[PDB]
């Protein structure tokens, strides 16, 4: 109960919530990879890819990016399930696996954006304006929030000769 309603974990939970919602929105927003051939700037996305100058249409073409993205979102769902179950019936310990899942979702998103950076580098020079900063911010938010939630969930480092972990609260 003590590390459940404290503000130090409430703020990290809020950060995780905004990060997860913006990450879920950022999987469809393909506004990060633009390439100028040299009036034919392109748009590269996980699912559908298109180039625009009327005649505009986006469709697929490296599906490992999609697979790791769905794995990351499944991790986010499991973390949210654990976090929700932690609050009710005083499950104070369930906040740790939620942190682990959030951290791993952030890492999976980081690897997905890394593979997409490799893809856009292998295609002129690109430019990140809207969605790459969004994905990097989502990764940073999820990673730091998961790490902080894990650190707050773990009780404390003893700092006393008699004090030890797994004490009676």
């Amino acid at each position: 109960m003590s590390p459940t309603e404290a503000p130090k974990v409430r703020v990290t939970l809020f950060c995780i919530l905004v990060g997860i919602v913006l990450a879920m929105t950022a999987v469809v927003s393909d506004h990060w990879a633009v390439l100028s051939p040299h009036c034919e700037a392109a748009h590269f996305g996980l699912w559908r890819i298109c180039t625009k100058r009327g005649e505009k249409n986006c469709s697929y073409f490296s599906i490992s990016a999609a697979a790791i993205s769905v794995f990351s979102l499944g991790f986010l769902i499991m973390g949210t399930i654990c976090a929700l179950m932690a609050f009710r019936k005083k499950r104070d310990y369930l906040l740790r696996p939620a942190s682990m899942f959030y951290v791993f979702a952030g890492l999976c998103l980081f690897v997905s954006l890394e593979v997409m950076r490799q893809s856009v580098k292998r295609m002129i020079e690109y430019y990140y304006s809207w969605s790459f900063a969004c994905a990097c911010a989502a990764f940073v938010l999820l990673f730091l929030g998961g790490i902080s939630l894990l650190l707050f969930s773990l009780p404390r480092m003893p700092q006393n000769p008699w004090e030890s972990c797994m004490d009676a609260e």
Binding site: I63, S64, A67, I68, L107, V111, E114, V115
Partner: peptide, 23 residues
């Protein structure tokens, strides 16, 4: 999944002997 069709995840199995200290 790479074989079916990313480098730092191989470091997690190295940390397996950090838990060796528990004893």
């Amino acid at each position: 999944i790479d074989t079916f069709l990313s480098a730092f995840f191989r470091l997690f199995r190295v940390m397996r002997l950090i838990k060796l200290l528990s004893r």
